[PDB]
Amino acid sequence: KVFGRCELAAAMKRHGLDNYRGYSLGNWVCAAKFESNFNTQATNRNTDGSTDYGILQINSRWWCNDGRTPGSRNLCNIPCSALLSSDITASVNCAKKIVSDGNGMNAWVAWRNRCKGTDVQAWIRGCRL
Numbered sequence: 352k353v354f355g356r357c358e359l360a361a362a363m364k365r366h367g368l369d370n371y372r373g374y375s376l377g378n379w380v381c382a383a384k385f386e387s388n389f390n391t392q393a394t395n396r397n398t399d400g401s402t403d404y405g406i407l408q409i410n411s412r413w414w415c416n417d418g419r420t421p422g423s424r425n426l427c428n429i430p431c432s433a434l435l436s437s438d439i440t441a442s443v444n445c446a447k448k449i450v451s452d453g454n455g456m457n458a459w460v461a462w463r464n465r466c467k468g469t470d471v472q473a474w475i476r477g478c479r480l
């Protein structure tokens with residue numbers, strides 16, 4: 352599923368991401384835009400053999416099991432394919448665990464390079480919510 356901007360903002364709000372660990376909703380919408388272009392089916396392979404999955408591009412080296420990242424962890428206790436669903440619940444619940452690990456949203460390279468320090472509330476302007 353490819354989300355609309357306000358459609359995704361509403362879904363993340365419903366799932367409790369607005370101000371989660373201090374990150375306003377616009378941060379999460381900005382991260383999703385540049386990580387995945389709002390596409391729940393996005394995948395990208397990394398140099399170390401791991402793969403990033405879903406609308407927030409969660410990585411198989413630590414957070415999910417894809418059966419092909421040897422010596423990796425599965426800290427969200429979930430198959431990576433669950434991160435590709437049109438239902439974003441699994442992605443949001445796993446992202447809550449990531450952002451709570453000490454490094455905040457710096458875990459998402461696109462957020463650090465393209466959202467951090469910008470007017471992130473622009474990403475939810477015009478939305479009803």
Ligand code: NA
Pocket residue numbers: 411412413414415416417420423424425
């Ligand atoms: Na893994």
